[PDB]
């Protein structure tokens, strides 16, 4: 059908540059004007610049000094280059025909660019152990603290996906150390703590690390 | 530069409610016509619903409609449905014959109203495993509460803590429309072991609930 396939992205040291491209499928890149847009974690959408259908690039004032948007009619691509990047340029970056006044609209899938001097590192996964004795009316809370990994993202499942009810996996926070940390919890019956095994499965594809952590009740 | 503003930024509504979201541009949009409305759900890319102010894209429910002119535009949802709770963005095109720009509004988050619900509050000491490494993470869980607004405060030997905690909140639950919240107090192993009483206090309106442990006492 019609697609806009986005590529590039990953890690950029502060002061470095990003290069992202989108390849059009089912239409000609020359036919339309395309924007670049970004979204920092938990924030709103932000316009970077626009390459008209005629091939002239204009930029949001905040982005003009560092940004270049070009197209390659031979390869059917559009491309964004930004240099002198800083931490606040960490965001999901999208190419898109926004379709504000025309019927055609299409977006790339988005790709994360993280701007940081941190080194890629898998998480340390510590237990949030439930007390053997409930103090909350017969339910127990347990989980795993997924600490000091970089970059985003991680996924967490419980018992290889068999336990989903009552699970809350929280958005990560960025620590002052530049590493991420998140917790994932589940509430269960405290009567199940003796019979049921609880294992969190933590995947960190950026560091090619998977951690499975059995969370056992706390004694005494 | 060019700037767009949506009102409100946050909206709580019930299924069946009529919803109106306004958007004002700092200057007239291209041809007084080039505004679209997008819908975005957590972890997903933005989906366009309306373009050219009032045109609906194929497959977009007719309960969505768009109006306005020049600098002012309005998204109307005639009867809010479960699949409509999401964040909505207006997006406008601007420029001249040798100028071309776009701007987004800040977004309007439409969440689902429900009964007040107090959190189940749990507090986790740092694991012995972690303490071996020289850091202590103390974790306070607020499980399945409403509304989202809540003040979490940490106390160590009855001393209010400040600056040494970070907090995260889930998106509204698909089933019961509540929120959950995780707050982590970070201390050195040394500091942790120089104190006994660790307490997480949750305040919502007229109620404060404080949950405590004493280090070493199971």
């Amino acid at each position: 059908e019609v697609q806009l396939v986005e590529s590039g992205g990953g890690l950029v040291q502060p002061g470095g540059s990003l290069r992202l491209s989108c390849t059009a499928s089912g239409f000609s890149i020359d036919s339309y004007g395309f924007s670049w847009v970004r979204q920092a974690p938990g924030k709103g959408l932000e316009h970077i610049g626009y390459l008209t259908a005629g091939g002239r690039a204009f930029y949001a004032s905040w982005a003009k000094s560092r940004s270049t948007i070009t197209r390659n009619t031979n390869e059917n691509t559009v491309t964004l280059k930004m240099n002198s990047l800083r931490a606040e340029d960490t965001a999901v970056y999208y190419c898109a025909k926004l379709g504000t006044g025309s019927r055609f609209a299409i977006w790339g899938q988005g790709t994360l660019v993280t701007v940081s001097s941190a080194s890629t590192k898998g998480p340390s996964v510590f237990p949030l152990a439930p007390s053997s004795k409930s103090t909350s009316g017969g339910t127990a809370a347990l989980g795993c603290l997924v600490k000091d990994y970089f970059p985003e993202p991680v996924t967490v499942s419980w018992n290889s996906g068999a336990l989903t009810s009552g699970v809350h996996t929280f958005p990560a926070v960025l620590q002052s150390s530049g590493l991420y940390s998140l917790s994932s919890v589940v509430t269960v019956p405290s009567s199940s703590l003796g019979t049921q095994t609880y294992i969190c499965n933590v995947n960190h594809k950026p560091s090619n690390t998977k951690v499975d952590k059995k969370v056992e009740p706390k004694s005494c | 530069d060019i700037q767009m503003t949506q009102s409100p930024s946050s909206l709580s509504a019930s299924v069946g409610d009529r919803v109106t979201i306004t958007c004002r541009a700092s200057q007239s949009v291209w041809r007084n016509k080039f505004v679209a409305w997008y819908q975005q759900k957590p972890g997903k890319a933005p989906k366009r619903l309306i373009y050219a102010i009032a045109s609906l894209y194929s497959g977009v429910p007719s309960r969505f409609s768009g109006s306005g002119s020049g600098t002012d535009f309005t998204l109307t949802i005639s009867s809010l449905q479960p699949e409509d709770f999401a964040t909505y963005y207006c997006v406008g095109h601007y420029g001249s014959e040798n100028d071309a720009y776009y701007a987004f509004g800040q977004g309007t988050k439409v969440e689902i109203k429900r009964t007040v619900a107090a959190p189940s509050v749990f507090i986790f000491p740092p694991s012995d495993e972690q303490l071996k490494s020289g850091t202590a993470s103390v974790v306070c869980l607020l499980n399945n509460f409403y509304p989202r607004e809540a003040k979490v405060s940490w106390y160590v030997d009855n001393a209010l803590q400040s600056g040494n905690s970070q907090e995260s909140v889930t998106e509204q639950d698909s089933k019961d429309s509540t929120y959950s919240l995780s707050s982590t107090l970070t201390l050195s192993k040394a500091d942790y072991e120089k104190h006994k009483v660790y307490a997480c206090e949750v305040t919502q309106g007229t109620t404060s609930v404080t949950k405590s442990f004493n280090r070493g006492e199971c």
């Binding site: 259908a53 005629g54 002239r56 025309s102 | 095109h93 001249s96 071309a100 720009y101």
Partner: peptide, 5 residues
């Protein structure tokens, strides 16, 4: 149809 044309 867009600006800058």
């Amino acid at each position: 149809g867009x600006a800058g044309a």
